[PDB]
Coordinates of N, CA and C in Angstrom, one line a residue:
X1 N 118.7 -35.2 116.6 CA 120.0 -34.9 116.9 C 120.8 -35.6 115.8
X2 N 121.7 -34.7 115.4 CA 121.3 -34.5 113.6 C 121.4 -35.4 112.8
X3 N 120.0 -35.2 112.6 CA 119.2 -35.4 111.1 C 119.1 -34.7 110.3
X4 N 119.8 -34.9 109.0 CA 119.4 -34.2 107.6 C 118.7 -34.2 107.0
X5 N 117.4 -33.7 106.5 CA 116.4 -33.5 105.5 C 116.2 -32.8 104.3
X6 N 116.2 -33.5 103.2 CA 116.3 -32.7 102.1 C 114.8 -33.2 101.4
X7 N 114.4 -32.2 100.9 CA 112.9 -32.3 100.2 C 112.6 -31.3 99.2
X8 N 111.8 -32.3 97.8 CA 111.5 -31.7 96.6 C 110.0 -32.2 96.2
X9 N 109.0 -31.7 95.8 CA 107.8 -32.1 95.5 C 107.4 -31.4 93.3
X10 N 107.2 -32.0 92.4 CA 106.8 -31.7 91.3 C 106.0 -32.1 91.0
X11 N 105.0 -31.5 89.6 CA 103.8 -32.0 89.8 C 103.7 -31.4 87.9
X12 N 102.9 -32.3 87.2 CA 102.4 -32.0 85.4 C 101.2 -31.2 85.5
X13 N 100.8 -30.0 86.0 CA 100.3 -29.4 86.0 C 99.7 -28.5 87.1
X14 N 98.3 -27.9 87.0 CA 97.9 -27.6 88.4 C 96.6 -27.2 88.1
X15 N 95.6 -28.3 88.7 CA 96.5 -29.4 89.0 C 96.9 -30.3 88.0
X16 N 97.5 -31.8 88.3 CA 98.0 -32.8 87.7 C 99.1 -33.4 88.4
X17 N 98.9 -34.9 87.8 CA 99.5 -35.9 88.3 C 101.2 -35.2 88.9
X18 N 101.1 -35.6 90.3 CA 102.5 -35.1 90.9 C 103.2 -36.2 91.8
X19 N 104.4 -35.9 92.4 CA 105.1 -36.8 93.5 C 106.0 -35.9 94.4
X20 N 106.3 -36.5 95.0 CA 107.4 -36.1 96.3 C 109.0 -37.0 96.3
X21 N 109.9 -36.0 96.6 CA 111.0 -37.1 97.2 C 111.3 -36.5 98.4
X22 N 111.8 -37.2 99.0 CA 112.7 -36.9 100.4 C 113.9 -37.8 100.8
X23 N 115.0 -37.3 101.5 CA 115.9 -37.8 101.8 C 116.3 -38.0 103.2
X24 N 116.3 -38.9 104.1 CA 116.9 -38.7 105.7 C 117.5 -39.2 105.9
X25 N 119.0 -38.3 106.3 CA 120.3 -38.8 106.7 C 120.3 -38.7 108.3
X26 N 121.5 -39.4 108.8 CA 121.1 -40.0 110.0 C 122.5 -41.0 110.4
X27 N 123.5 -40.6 110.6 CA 125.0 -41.8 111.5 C 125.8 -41.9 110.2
X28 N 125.1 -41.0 108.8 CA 125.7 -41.5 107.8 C 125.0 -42.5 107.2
X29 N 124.2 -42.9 107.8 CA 123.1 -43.4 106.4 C 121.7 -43.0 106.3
X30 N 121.3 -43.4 105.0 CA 120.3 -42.4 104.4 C 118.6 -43.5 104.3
X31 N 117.5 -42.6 104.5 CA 116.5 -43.6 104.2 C 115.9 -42.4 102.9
X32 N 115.1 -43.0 102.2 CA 114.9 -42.3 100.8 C 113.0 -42.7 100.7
X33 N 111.7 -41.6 100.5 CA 110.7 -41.3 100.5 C 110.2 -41.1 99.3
X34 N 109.0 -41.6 98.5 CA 108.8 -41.1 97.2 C 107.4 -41.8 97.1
X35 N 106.4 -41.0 96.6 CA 105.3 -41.1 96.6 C 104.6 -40.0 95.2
X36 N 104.0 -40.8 94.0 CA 103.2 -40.2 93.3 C 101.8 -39.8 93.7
X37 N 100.9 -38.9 93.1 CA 99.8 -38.6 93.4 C 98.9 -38.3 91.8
X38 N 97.5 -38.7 92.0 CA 97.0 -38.6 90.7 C 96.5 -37.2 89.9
X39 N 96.3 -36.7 90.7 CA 95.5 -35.3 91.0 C 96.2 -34.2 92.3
X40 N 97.2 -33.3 91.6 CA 97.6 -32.7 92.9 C 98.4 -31.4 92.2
X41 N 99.2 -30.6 93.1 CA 99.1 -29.3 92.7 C 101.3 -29.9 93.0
X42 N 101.5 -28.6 92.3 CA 103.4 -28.7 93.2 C 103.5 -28.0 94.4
X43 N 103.0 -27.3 94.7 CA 102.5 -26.6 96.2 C 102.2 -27.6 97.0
X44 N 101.3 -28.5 96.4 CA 101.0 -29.7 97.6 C 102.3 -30.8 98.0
X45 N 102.6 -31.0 97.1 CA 103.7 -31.9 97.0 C 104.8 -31.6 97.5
X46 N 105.4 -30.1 97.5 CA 106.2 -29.3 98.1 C 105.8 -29.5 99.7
X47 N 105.0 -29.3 100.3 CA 104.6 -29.8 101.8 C 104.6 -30.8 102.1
X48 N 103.9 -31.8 100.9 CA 104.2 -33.2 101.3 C 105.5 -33.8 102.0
X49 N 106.5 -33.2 100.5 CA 107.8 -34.3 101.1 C 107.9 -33.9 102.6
X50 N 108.4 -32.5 103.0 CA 108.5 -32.1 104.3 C 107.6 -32.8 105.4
X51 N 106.4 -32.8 105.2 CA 105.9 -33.6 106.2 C 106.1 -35.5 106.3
X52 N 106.2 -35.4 105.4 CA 106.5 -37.0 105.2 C 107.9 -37.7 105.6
X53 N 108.8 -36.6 105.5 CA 110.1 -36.7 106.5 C 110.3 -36.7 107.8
X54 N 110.0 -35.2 108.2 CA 109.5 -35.5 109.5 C 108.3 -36.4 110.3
X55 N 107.4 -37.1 109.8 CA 106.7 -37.6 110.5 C 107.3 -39.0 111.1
X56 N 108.6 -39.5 109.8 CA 109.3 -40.1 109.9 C 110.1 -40.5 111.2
X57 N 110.1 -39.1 111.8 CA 111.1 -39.1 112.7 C 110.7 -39.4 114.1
X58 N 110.8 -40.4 114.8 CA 110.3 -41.3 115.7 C 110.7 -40.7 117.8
X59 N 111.7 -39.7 117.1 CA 112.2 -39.1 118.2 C 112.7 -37.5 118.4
X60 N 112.4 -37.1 119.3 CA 113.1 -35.3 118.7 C 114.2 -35.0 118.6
X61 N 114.5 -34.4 117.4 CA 115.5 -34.4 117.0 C 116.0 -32.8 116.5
X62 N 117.0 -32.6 116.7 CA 117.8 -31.3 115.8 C 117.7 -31.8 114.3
X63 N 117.4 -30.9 113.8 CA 117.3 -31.3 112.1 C 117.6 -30.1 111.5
X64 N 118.5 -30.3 110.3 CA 118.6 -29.4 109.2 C 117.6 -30.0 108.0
X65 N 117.1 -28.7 107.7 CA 115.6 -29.4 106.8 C 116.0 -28.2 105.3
X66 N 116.5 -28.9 104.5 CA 116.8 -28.2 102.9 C 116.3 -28.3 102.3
X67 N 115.6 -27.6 101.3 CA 114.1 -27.4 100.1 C 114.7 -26.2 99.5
X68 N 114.1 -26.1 98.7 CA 114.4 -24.8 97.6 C 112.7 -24.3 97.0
X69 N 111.8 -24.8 97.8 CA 110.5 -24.2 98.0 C 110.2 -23.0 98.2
X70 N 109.3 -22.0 97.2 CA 109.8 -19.9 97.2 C 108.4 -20.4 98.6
X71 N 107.4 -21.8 97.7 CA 106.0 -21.2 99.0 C 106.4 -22.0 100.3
X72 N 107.2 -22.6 100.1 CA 107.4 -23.5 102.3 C 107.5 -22.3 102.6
X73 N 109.2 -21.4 101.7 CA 110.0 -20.5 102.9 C 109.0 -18.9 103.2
X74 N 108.0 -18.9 102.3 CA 107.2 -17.8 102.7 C 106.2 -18.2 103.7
X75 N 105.9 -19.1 103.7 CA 104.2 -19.3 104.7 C 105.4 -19.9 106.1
X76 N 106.5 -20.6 106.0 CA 107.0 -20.7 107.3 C 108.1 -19.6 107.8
X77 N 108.5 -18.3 107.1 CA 108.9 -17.6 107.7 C 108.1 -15.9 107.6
X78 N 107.1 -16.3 106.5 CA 106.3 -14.7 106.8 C 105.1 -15.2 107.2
X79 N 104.0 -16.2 106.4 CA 102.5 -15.9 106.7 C 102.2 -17.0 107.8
X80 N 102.6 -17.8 108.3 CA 102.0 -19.4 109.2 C 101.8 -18.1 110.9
X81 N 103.0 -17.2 110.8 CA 102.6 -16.3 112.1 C 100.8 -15.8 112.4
X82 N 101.1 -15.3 111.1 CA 99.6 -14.9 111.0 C 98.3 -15.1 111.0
X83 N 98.7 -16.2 110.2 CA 97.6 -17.4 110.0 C 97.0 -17.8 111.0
X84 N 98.1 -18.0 111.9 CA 97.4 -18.7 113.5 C 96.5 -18.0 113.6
X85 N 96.8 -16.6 114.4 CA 96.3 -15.5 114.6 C 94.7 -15.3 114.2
X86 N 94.6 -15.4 113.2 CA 93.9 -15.4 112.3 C 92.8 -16.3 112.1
X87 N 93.2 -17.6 112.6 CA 92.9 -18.9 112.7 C 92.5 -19.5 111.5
X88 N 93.3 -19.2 110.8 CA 93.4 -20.0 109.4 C 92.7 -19.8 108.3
X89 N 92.1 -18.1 108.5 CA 91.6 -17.8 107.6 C 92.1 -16.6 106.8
X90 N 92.0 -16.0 105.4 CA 92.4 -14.8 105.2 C 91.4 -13.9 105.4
X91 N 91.6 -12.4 104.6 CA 90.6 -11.4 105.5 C 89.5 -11.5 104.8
X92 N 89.1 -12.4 103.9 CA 87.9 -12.6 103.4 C 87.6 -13.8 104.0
X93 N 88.1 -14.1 104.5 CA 87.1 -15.2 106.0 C 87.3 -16.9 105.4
X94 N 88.1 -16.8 104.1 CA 88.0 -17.9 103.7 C 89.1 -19.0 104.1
X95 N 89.1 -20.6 104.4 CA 90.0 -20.9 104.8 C 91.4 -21.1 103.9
X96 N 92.3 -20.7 104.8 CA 93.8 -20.8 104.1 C 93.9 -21.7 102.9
X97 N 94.6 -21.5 101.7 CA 94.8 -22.5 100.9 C 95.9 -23.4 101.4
X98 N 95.4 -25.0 101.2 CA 96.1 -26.0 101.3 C 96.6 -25.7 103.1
X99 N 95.0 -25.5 103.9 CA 95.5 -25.3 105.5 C 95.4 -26.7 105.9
X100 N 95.0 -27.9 105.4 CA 95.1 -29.0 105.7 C 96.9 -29.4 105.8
X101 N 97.5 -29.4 104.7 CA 99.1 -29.4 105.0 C 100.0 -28.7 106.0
X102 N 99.4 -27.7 105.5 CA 99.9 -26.3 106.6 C 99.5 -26.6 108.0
X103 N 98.6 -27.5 108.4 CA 98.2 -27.4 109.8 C 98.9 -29.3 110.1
X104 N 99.0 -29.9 109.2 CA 99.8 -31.1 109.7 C 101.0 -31.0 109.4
X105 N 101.6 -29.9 108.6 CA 103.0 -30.1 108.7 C 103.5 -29.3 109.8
X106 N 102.5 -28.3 110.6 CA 103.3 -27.5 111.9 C 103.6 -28.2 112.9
X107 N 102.0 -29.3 113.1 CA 102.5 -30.4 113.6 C 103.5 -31.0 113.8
X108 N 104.1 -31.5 113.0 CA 105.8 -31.9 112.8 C 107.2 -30.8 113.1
X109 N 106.3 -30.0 112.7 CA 107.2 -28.6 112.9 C 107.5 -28.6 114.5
X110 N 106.4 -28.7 115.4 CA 106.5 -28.2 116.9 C 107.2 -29.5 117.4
X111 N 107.4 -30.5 116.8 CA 108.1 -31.8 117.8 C 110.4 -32.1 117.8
X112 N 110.2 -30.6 116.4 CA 111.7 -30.6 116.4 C 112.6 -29.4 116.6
X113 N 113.8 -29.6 117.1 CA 114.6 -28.1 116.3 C 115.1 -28.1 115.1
X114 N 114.4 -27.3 114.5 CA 114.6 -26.8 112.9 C 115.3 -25.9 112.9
X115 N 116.5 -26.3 111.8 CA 117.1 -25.5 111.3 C 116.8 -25.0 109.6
X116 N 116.5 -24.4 109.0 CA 116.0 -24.1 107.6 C 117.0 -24.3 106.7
X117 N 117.4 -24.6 105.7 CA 118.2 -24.7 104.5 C 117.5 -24.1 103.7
X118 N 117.1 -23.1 102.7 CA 116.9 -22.4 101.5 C 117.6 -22.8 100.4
X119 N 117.6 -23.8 99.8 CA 118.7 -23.5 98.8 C 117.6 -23.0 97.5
X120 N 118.5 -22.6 96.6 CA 118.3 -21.4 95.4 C 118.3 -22.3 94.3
X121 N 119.2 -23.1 93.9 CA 119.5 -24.0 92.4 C 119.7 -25.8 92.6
X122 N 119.5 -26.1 92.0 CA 120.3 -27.8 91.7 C 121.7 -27.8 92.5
X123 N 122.9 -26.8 91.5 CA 123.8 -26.9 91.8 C 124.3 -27.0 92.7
X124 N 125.3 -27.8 92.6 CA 126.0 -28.4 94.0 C 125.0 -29.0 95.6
X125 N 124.0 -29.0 94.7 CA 123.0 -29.7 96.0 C 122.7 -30.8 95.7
X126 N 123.4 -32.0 95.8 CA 122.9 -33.2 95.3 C 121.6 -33.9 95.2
X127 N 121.8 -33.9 96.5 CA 120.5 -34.4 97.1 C 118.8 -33.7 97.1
X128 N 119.2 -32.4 96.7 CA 118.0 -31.9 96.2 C 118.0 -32.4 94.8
X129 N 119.1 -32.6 94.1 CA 119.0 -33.1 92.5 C 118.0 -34.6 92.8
X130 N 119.0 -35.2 93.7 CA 117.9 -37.0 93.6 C 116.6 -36.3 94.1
X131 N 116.4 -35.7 94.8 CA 114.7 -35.8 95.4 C 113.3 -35.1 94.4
X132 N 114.1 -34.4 93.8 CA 113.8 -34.2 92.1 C 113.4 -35.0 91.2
X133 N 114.5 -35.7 90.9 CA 114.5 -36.9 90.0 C 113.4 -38.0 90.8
X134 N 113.4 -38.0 91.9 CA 112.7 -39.0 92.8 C 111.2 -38.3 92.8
X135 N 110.9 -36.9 92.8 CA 109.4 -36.9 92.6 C 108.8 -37.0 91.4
X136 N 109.6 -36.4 90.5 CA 109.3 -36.5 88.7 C 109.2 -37.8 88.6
X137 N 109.8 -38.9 88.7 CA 109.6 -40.5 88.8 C 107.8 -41.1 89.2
X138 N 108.1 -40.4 90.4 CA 106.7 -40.8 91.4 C 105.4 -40.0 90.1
X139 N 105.6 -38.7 89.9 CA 104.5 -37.8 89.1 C 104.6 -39.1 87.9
X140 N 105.0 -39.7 87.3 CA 104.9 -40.2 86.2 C 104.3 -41.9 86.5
X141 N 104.2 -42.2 87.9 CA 103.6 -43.2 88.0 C 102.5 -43.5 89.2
X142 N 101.6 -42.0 89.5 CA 100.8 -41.7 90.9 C 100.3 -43.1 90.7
X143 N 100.2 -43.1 92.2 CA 99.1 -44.5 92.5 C 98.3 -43.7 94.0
X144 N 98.3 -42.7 94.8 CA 97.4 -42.2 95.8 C 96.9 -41.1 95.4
X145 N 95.7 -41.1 96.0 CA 95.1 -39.9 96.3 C 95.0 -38.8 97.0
X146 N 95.6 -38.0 96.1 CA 95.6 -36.9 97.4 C 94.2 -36.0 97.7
X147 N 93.7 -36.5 98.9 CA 92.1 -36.4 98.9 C 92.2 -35.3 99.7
X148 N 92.8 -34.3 100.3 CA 93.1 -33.1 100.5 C 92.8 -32.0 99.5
X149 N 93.1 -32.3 98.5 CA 93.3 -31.3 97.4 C 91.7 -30.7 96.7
X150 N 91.6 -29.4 96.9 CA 90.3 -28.5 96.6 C 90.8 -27.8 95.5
X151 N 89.9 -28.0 94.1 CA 90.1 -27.3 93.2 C 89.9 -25.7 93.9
X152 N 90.6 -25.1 93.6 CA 90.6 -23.7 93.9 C 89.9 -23.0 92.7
X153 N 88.9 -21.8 93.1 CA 88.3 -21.1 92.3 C 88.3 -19.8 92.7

């Protein structure tokens, strides 16, 4: 009962060393998330911050959740339907890429009301600017593992 969430994840390659930022606003003040990784994709990191915000959140809450993510807004508003269904596999039977995030960030998903934010650019989004600046920071000084992460072939 509103909570703001703003989240950006970058990453030096793919894979390669990456980070997350996140932002959670809250009465008017803010708590701020940032975590590098040694080995990891921007896809991953892009789910990261999201789940790492919400997991945050100790109580259920209305939340506006803003990212400028093309793969969050596709797998949570076209493919996660399917997926279920499917049970987390595609039609070659193989398991979903990166369904370990995808299946703990729905997690978080089902404990709130979400409202989506899409934004498109930097501009005029501040706070997507800092969580930017805040993953790029973290990519340049990983210290976890993201032991999740399957070279894809």
């Amino acid at each position: 009962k509103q909570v703001e969430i703003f989240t950006d994840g970058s990453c030096l390659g793919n894979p390669g060393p990456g980070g997350y930022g996140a932002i959670l606003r809250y009465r008017g003040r803010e708590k701020t998330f940032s975590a590098g990784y040694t080995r990891t994709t921007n896809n991953r990191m892009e789910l990261m911050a999201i789940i790492v915000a919400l997991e945050a959140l100790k109580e259920h809450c209305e939340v506006i959740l803003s990212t400028d993510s093309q793969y969050v807004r596709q797998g949570i508003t076209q493919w996660i339907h399917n997926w279920k269904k499917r049970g987390w596999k595609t039609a070659d039977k193989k398991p979903v890429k990166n369904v370990d995030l995808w299946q703990r960030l729905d997690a978080a998903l089902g404990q709130h009301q979400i409202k989506w934010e899409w934004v498109k650019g930097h501009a005029g989004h501040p706070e997507n600017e800092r969580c930017d600046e805040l993953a790029r920071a973290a990519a340049m000084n990983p210290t976890l593992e993201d032991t999740g992460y399957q070279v894809e072939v």
